[PDB]
């Protein structure tokens, strides 16, 4: 009669590494690394992302005409640019502190787009119908939906002053532009005053702008330029615009709501009616395991990105069947 | 392995022991078979479960220095977490295999300590009794209630 | 059918 | 006769965690985590902190009148602002490169406040008695103690030029202001010259300033503004001020001594006659253990901050009394 | 535990052994009592002491990117050091308990190796002598100077 | 040490065993000498080799905040990597010494298990045979092919 | 007859540390820490570094005359400044965005220095022979080799305009200067026009400059100053210079080739005909081990810097000879 | 009263 | 002359 002590073996082919030995076959192991994605853009907490498509953040917020389908979207779980996000500033120029503006939008989960200065009541004694072929739409010259090109009327551009008081209970993003014509003749044809100025002031913002006339290498058929500026008007505060030329005035502004856990990613993936807790630019990934090697850029409740190709912990025994 | 049992003095595992991680094979006049040690298997499952749960818990063209600092931060954190993840898994895998080895060794020594010189120790994990050990006797060995005085006289006669 | 293994660190144990 | 081998047990209820098991009772353990503070602000190496009280760094260094009790303090172990640190710039405006100035002060362990430009000898043919209700004191209009409001005298503001040579053997912090009146009438009433300029130059600093007249939303009863500027004048170098208007001139400046291990914290805790090696904004903490979970902001020789609620190492045995 | 002694074949600890971490209980005609093994206790204190000593050694509104980079750095370092602290303590606690287990196991085996078949090994940490073992005999066991030939004949007669 | 052999029941090492890490010393009528256990030495070299391979794989005056953030990043990464390097080496050194201890212990137990009561276990790593064990006999012990039944009768007579 | 089990000892005196014990003598160990250097500057992949010697990056790229030996060097494996790297801007002034320029050069592995504007054909009706004693050479007044001091001719400084189209297929670094005279008399003697301007524009760069006349504390015998500016002209783009005064014009520019693994170090070590994979400012170091404690600044494929004095892993046994 | 325990990693040992 | 030790983690083994 005999009794023997022994241990379990099976047909597992799982392998793990240790410090003393590589590729040990074991009876049971656990993968610790998410290493697949579903190739889709998905909702977070039931909320879809804002897909800018062929537009970038500048084209969206200025209202580049080619971005009209974006205008009514009011809330999103993250912002998606494409490699094709080309429609931005259609009249060439510099977007001042653009990267800071993107950083601000990265924590915005919704906003209200509203008329800060109605077109036909805010700027008496000026023309408000300026368009340009650089911002075309339907093969016709057009302009930013959220700004307004003020020009002389009846050979005169009187000094203007207008103000807006923020009674939204939320920060208001205000954008405007300054036109820099290529030569003095265009300056006088558009704004009459050669030594024009613009002033924009809040309680905690102030800047003066001048025509800065200069002939530039042409971009999109324009020797002149338009610079773009923004500020965040805090609740209760007033913004004041003063000008005798060159102002590309605000028309629509944005009352901002802040949220946690948003961001901006660039992705070639398509939206589907899927749901995830963790989105990457390649696709959605699961969130149960501690690590992932799909992509360093993630949105949501996500595993930690690592470079590892394999992370596998043994739970069972060294497997020695026979 | 560190404790000498798995892939050691017990050279291989048992595909026939399907119902646990460590246990017994017996042969007597009533027959033969495998039986897991359920207490040691459950205790090991508890420990490995706790271990697994423990493990599973833009810049513009004139801002290149800031861009490179941001990249240094991202790359350095990634280096550190890749290192931490891989090293913890290697270390814990070594410890898990040694834990199983220890569990087998301890079960073997518990049987050896019950049987004393009422059985001959072959050296491959097996004991050959110096007395007839029927199914109730085998179960007493597996359950830690083996009665050495009951069989000592028969065994001493056979050990001679 | 033998053990409490809520994480499934062991197999089915034949049952 | 018998001999048995065994191990110690006792009445310890200490528990520790391992990888395989949680809440193991052990005969002896050691806490590795400082998890209490004394609720006080304390001295470091026998040196008390500078408590700005109701003032911030701007109010202290400009000499906002409500900060007069701070004027004679010459050395400190760290700087403490309160949630009530409100008295700062009393005449509204922008403090240029303010955050960099705070960063500089974070390594200053003492200074000498001295007269860089005596009031009644430095600016002949100008008035030096300008005050404002925005900087009130004793219910009377007043002004920064370290600056001087120069205005026209007898209907004239002649061009001024003065210089200071740093013979302190240490960096000298020089602060000044530029006044931006709300309208041209105030500009001419105060400084006579409508097209006024200010020039401030050292060997490694140069900046020109203009009136920048503009009507702003009123802050503290002022439609005008005052911007504040600073530079560090290196030993042996000269600073030169030139102006025909708008200069808020330096009167007191600071010869700086640098030290290691200082900083700026915000705290609601009160000073006591206690001594520590490690100060946090909640209170002082001990320094013997490697980790602490009281606060991430620390001054001194301190344990490392961690999020952990418990860090306890076993030294004795698994405790199995019976 | 890994070495099978603590909470293993020596099922529980001794509140009566107050003067060390590991040691002995004896019974003979002269009486009974507990005595720490001072050498193994002191050696363990030295090692645990070395282990403990080893363990105990603004932005403005247009600078949000720099503010967030600073926060990323602070948060990432905090994550890493919280992880490092907690993991080192878990790993070292496991190793400390296994160290104590090993120390008990080694002391048990040292006694077993001195006594050989002059005592019967019960399996609970205890040995029952086959000869009378007075206080000097017990002290020789505790001090590693037990004289097996001195007692082998008496023991062989009793073991029979 | 954890497994009790090195600097334990085998009190010291052998400068005379030059050809391996663990092994044997014998004495019989034909003479004496040291011989490494080549299998256990090679296996240990393989493991330690895998372990070693596993281990061996400006700002201007108005930018002080950015300068200090850069310094914080550099200093924090340096602190972390100095800690990681020193701790991994301490932990792995402890494990290496315990690995060697285990290897010696396992070799000792393999010999003990071959010889059974055909030799007397001294307790210092040595066995004294109850039968004459010539060079072929010694080699069978070293190679794991010792034939206990061949010598059991002679040994039982001498053990008496 | 006897057989005994045992283990190897030898005459090793190597020591290692563990967690439970320090200074354990072992039979064999491995050093993991590179702790020596060869005291030399060496080649990387057979390519020598650029040794700026007594010049800094500014003196090299502007062509300070004292840096003439550097002019023909076209490729390098890293850039070495010395503690004696003094020859830089010889006419005093500010080098705008200098640190960003250094950052750009840190990834340049070669360039082509070429004439962007030939001296005698690019600026008709202006003098091109301006020199200064502040930039002396052979005891004679001289000037930057890569720039050109344009001054009035026959009492006149007509408005100039010239352009360069980048047909290099690579980014072109263009440097220029703006002179700020000490007083109006020098302004008119040099450039005739008191209200002079300079304009520099590309497609993605535009800046206007003015004389900014001001008397400064003298540096290198100069009350005036010269500011230095640069931009990267992308392939296919055009740069345009326009001026009626004060322009220190580009003459030579640099077509840049980018590489990985370069950098800028400061070192007192001398070049030798040695080869390394890893260079530090103290000397070259080996690359076989995982860690090094020589210096935190490294170029090449390098071990990781640590503060440790010793890192040694045991491979053999606790050594107990007897 | 028995051991050198300068860190006090063990208790009073009854003395 | 006995072992495969390509890293040289052991000594010369007397040969
Ligand atoms: C690998 O081994 C598996 C079993 O091991 C268990 O599972 C693995 C993953 C691991 O956790 C181990 O630790 C575990 O022990 C195989 O899966 C089993 O396959 C067998 C088939 O032989 C299944 O069984 C049958 O079940 C039927 C329904 O209950 C019974 O009717 C049947 O009885 C007949 O056959 C047997 C002989 O097998 C006779 O003795 C009877 O008298 C009667 O004639 C069997 O009992 C069992 O259910 C499977 N278990 C699991 C957990 O899946 C696996 O085999 C593969 O997978 C199964 C599902 C089938 O697809 C097989 O054809 C296939 O080979 C092994 N894999 C490989 C590649 O060999
Ligand atoms: C927990 O156990 C403690 C003892 O264990 C030691 O300390 C702990 C922390 C740990 O390190 C262990 O490893 C150690 O072994 C208790 O503290 C002891 O309490 C006893 C009281 O019973 C104290 O003793 C007395 O000392 C007096 C002065 O020397 C003696 O006169 C007295 O003798 C009389 O009583 C005894 C019976 O106890 C008789 O046999 C005598 O003949 C005589 O009549 C005792 O010897 C001892 O000094 C304490 N040791 C320490 C280190 O404090 C602790 O008990 C608590 O703490 C003590 C201080 C008192 O407040 C007790 O009332 C109290 O219960 C235990 N704690 C709990 C909660 O039970
Ligand atoms: C430390 O020990 C070394 C040997 O241990 C080995 O190497 C070390 C590093 C480690 O890896 C250990 O694990 C290894 O086991 C010494 O090096 C050896 O020295 C001896 C000299 O005694 C050398 O041997 C001689 O070799 C000659 C050529 O083959 C033989 O002719 C000679 O034979 C004569 O001498 C012997 C007695 O030694 C007689 O028995 C013979 O009959 C005959 O008369 C020897 O065999 C051996 O080659 C060396 N091995 C190595 C690997 O270097 C080392 O000694 C130092 O180093 C050597 C090179 C010489 O410089 C010695 O003088 C010197 O002491 C030890 N070091 C110290 C400080 O003691
Ligand atoms: C482990 O297995 C993988 C895949 O089978 C193989 O690529 C690798 O080389 C193996 N490593 C070793 C050490 O055998
Ligand atoms: C996520 O896990 C589920 C199972 O819970 C699986 O079906 C799905 O494919 C996983 N998703 C990805 C992207 O791997
Ligand atoms: C450990 O004990 C604490 C407090 O007694 C309790 O909150 C926690 O749930 C316990 N954990 C386990 C695993 O029992
Ligand atoms: C610091 O330690 C001392 C004992 O050394 C203790 O009395 C004091 O309360 C501790 N301070 C805090 C804040 O815990
Ligand atoms: C270890 O040895 C070094 C050098 O011999 C010595 O400086 C150090 O103090 C020693 N440490 C211990 C703990 O003995
Ligand atoms: C690098 O290693 C070689 C041996 O491979 C050695 O000769 C040389 O001295 C080492 N260099 C330094 C700087 O230590």
Residue numbers in the entry:
A (entry chain C), D (entry chain C), G (entry chain C): 11 to 54, 54A, 55 to 83, 83A, 84 to 95, 95A, 96 to 125, 125A, ...
B (entry chain D), E (entry chain D), F (entry chain D): 1 to 57, 69 to 171
C (entry chain G), H (entry chain G), I (entry chain G): 44 to 58
From the paper:
Here we report a unique, efficient and effective structure-based strategy to design peptidic modalities based on a single domain antibody. This strategy was used to graft the relatively long and flexible CDR3 loop of the single domain antibody sdAb38 onto dipeptide templates to design mimetics that can potently bind and neutralize influenza A viruses. To elucidate the structural basis of binding and neutralization of influenza virus by the PMD-based peptides, crystal structures of the neutralizing (template-based CP1 and CP8) and non-neutralizing (non-template based CP14) peptides in complex with H1/PR8 and H5/Viet HAs were determined at 1.59–2.87 Å resolution, respectively. All peptides recognize the hydrophobic surface and embedded cavities at the interface of HA1-HA2 in the HA stem region. This region is highly conserved in HAs across influenza A groups 1 and 2 and influenza B viruses, and the target of HA stem broadly neutralizing antibodies (bnAbs), including sdAb3854.
Proline-proline and proline-glycine template-based peptides CP3 and CP6, respectively, have similar length (15 amino acid residues) and composition as the cysteine-cysteine template-based peptide CP8 except for the Glu98→Arg98 substitution in CP8. Compared to CP3, CP8 demonstrated a significant improvement in binding (KD of 0.32–0.33 µM by SPR) and potency (IC50 of 0.11–1.55 μM in AlphaLISA) against H1/Cal and H5/Viet HAs. The HA-CP8 complex was also less stable compared to the CP1 and CP4 complexes, with 2- to 11-fold higher dissociation rate constants and correspondingly 2- to 10-fold reduced residence time (t1/2 = 0.7–6.5 s) against H1 and H5 HAs. Although the crystallization pH is well below the pH of membrane fusion, the structure of the H1/PR8 HA complex with CP8 is essentially identical to the pre-fusion apo form of H1/PR8 and H1/Cal HAs at pH 8.0. This observation is consistent with the previously reported crystal structures of HA-antibody65–67and HA-peptide17 complexes obtained at low pH and that were also reported to inhibit fusion.
